[PDB]
Design an enzyme around this catalytic site. Sequence first.
Site, PDB file in Angstrom:
ATOM      1  N   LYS A  47       0.098   1.325   1.776  1.00 44.68           N
ATOM      2  CA  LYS A  47       0.667   1.349   0.409  1.00 44.68           C
ATOM      3  C   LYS A  47       2.087   1.894   0.438  1.00 44.68           C
ATOM      4  CE  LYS A  47      -2.783   3.439  -1.536  1.00 44.68           C
ATOM      5  NZ  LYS A  47      -3.501   3.604  -0.246  1.00 44.68           N
ATOM      6  N   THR A  48       2.286   3.028   1.097  1.00 48.82           N
ATOM      7  CA  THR A  48       3.634   3.614   1.249  1.00 48.82           C
ATOM      8  C   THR A  48       4.538   2.665   2.039  1.00 48.82           C
ATOM      9  OG1 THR A  48       2.737   5.833   1.137  1.00 48.82           O
ATOM     10  CG2 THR A  48       4.935   5.621   2.069  1.00 48.82           C
ATOM     11  N   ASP A  92       3.215   7.668  -5.671  1.00 51.30           N
ATOM     12  CA  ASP A  92       1.941   7.578  -4.981  1.00 51.30           C
ATOM     13  C   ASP A  92       0.938   8.397  -5.785  1.00 51.30           C
ATOM     14  OD1 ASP A  92       0.102   6.826  -2.994  1.00 51.30           O
ATOM     15  OD2 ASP A  92       0.720   8.414  -1.595  1.00 51.30           O
ATOM     16  N   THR A 136      -5.808   4.436  -5.276  1.00 53.34           N
ATOM     17  CA  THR A 136      -6.943   3.920  -4.493  1.00 53.34           C
ATOM     18  C   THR A 136      -7.700   2.727  -5.129  1.00 53.34           C
ATOM     19  OG1 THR A 136      -8.211   5.784  -5.319  1.00 53.34           O
ATOM     20  CG2 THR A 136      -7.237   5.979  -3.113  1.00 53.34           C
ATOM     21  N   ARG A 195      -3.174   2.111  10.059  1.00 59.66           N
ATOM     22  CA  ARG A 195      -2.810   3.517  10.339  1.00 59.66           C
ATOM     23  C   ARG A 195      -3.637   4.059  11.502  1.00 59.66           C
ATOM     24  NH1 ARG A 195       0.938   7.303   7.995  1.00 59.66           N
ATOM     25  NH2 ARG A 195       1.735   6.382   9.939  1.00 59.66           N
TER      26      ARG A 195
HETATM   27  N1  LIG Z   1       0.369  -5.033   7.270  1.00 65.71           N
HETATM   28  C1  LIG Z   1       0.567  -4.142   8.264  1.00 65.71           C
HETATM   29  N2  LIG Z   1       0.835  -4.563   9.527  1.00 65.71           N
HETATM   30  C2  LIG Z   1       1.033  -3.691  10.542  1.00 65.71           C
HETATM   31  N3  LIG Z   1       0.987  -2.349  10.374  1.00 65.71           N
HETATM   32  C3  LIG Z   1       0.733  -1.789   9.159  1.00 65.71           C
HETATM   33  C4  LIG Z   1       0.504  -2.678   8.008  1.00 65.71           C
HETATM   34  N4  LIG Z   1       0.283  -1.879   6.946  1.00 65.71           N
HETATM   35  C5  LIG Z   1       0.359  -0.590   7.374  1.00 65.71           C
HETATM   36  N5  LIG Z   1       0.639  -0.538   8.693  1.00 65.71           N
HETATM   37  C6  LIG Z   1       0.754   0.708   9.505  1.00 65.71           C
HETATM   38  O1  LIG Z   1      -0.207   1.651   9.008  1.00 65.71           O
HETATM   39  C7  LIG Z   1       0.408   2.884   8.615  1.00 65.71           C
HETATM   40  C8  LIG Z   1      -0.109   3.308   7.234  1.00 65.71           C
HETATM   41  O2  LIG Z   1       0.758   2.934   6.169  1.00 65.71           O
HETATM   42  P1  LIG Z   1       0.835   3.760   4.783  1.00 65.71           P
HETATM   43  O3  LIG Z   1       1.839   3.040   3.930  1.00 65.71           O
HETATM   44  O4  LIG Z   1       1.048   5.222   5.099  1.00 65.71           O
HETATM   45  O5  LIG Z   1      -0.640   3.569   4.131  1.00 65.71           O
HETATM   46  P2  LIG Z   1      -1.128   4.252   2.738  1.00 65.71           P
HETATM   47  O6  LIG Z   1       0.150   4.632   2.023  1.00 65.71           O
HETATM   48  O7  LIG Z   1      -1.920   3.158   2.074  1.00 65.71           O
HETATM   49  O8  LIG Z   1      -1.993   5.422   3.146  1.00 65.71           O
HETATM   50  C9  LIG Z   1       1.919   2.689   8.727  1.00 65.71           C
HETATM   51  O9  LIG Z   1       2.517   3.773   9.443  1.00 65.71           O
HETATM   52  C10 LIG Z   1       2.114   1.376   9.455  1.00 65.71           C
HETATM   53  O10 LIG Z   1       2.572   1.609  10.792  1.00 65.71           O
END
Ligand SMILES: Nc1ncnc2c1ncn2[C@@H]1O[C@H](COP(=O)(O)OP(=O)(O)O)[C@@H](O)[C@H]1O
Length: 311
Positions: A47-48, A92, A136, A195
């Site tokens: 998401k981030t 977020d 979420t 992640r």
């Molecule tokens: N579509 C994607 N393809 C490859 N890697 C991804 C993808 N989405 C997320 N990632 C990896 O997963 C990690 C999690 O991303 P993040 O934005 O922190 O998730 P959330 O904010 O949903 O917890 C990132 O550091 C990135 O390296």
Amino acid sequence: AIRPLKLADYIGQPSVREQMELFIHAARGRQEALDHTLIFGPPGLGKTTLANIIAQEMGVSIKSTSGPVLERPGDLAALLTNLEAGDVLFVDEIHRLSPIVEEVLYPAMEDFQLDIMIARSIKLDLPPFTLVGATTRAGMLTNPLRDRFGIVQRLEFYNVEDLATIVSRSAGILGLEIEPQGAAEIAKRARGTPRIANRLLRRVRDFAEVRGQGDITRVIADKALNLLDVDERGFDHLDRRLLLTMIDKFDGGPVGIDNLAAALSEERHTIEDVLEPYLIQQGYIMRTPRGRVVTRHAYLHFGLNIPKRLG
Ligand SMILES: Nc1ncnc2c1ncn2[C@@H]1O[C@H](COP(=O)(O)OP(=O)(O)O)[C@@H](O)[C@H]1O
């Protein structure tokens, strides 16, 4: 290095990628700010990452904050008044905005107008901007906040084939040799999340370099994941303690979320947002009106007999 900074590198969410590429190219074509965008789904799904990609693809700045951080209307106001035309304000955990702070957001989003109380109401013009919100699940927002988003994207757990592609890409970036079955072993045990898949790859690399030959094979991945206490289904120590607690202290359920949280010494949100979604998705836990229950598959996972009784 391994986090995608542009949509071309965003693997495993084809619908999200195709839609966002279209909406971004259209907004840029008009020299306008992108419409407010809501991104929802479980943690670790990107998401981030997607929020940052949006800013990057739009060619604008991104200011990141969180629902709990914005304790007063004035805290939000300070961010809004510091944005340049077209900037992304990423919030977020947006469902945790206090009801009164959420009120300021309504006119800021809809009319690019700040309306804040100081008693006196003050009305100020804002430059066009893009609010990117993340939560979420969408249903935990109010209808008024939800309805002010022009673009809504839903992220789902990634399938194992796409996670393997991601692991192989990351290995390539890191200069690591990896066998197809090695990428598959990590993907299988990555709990549906890029992640986690990426984190596990780093730990597997360590095992390969210290105890192996430096390359990632299925056997090296398995031994490394076993050392990390991650099982064949991608469950970690806490996931197993949750299931075993339901089985042992509550006879498999039904057990209310508060009773379960108290029995685990964990907060409610941790169980609901972090632990449960994958376990429900994979068929190990079910929600019912009387509480959470484990399924027969939870017993089978641990080599326990399936109880046969009445409800
Ligand atoms: N579509 C994607 N393809 C490859 N890697 C991804 C993808 N989405 C997320 N990632 C990896 O997963 C990690 C999690 O991303 P993040 O934005 O922190 O998730 P959330 O904010 O949903 O917890 C990132 O550091 C990135 O390296």
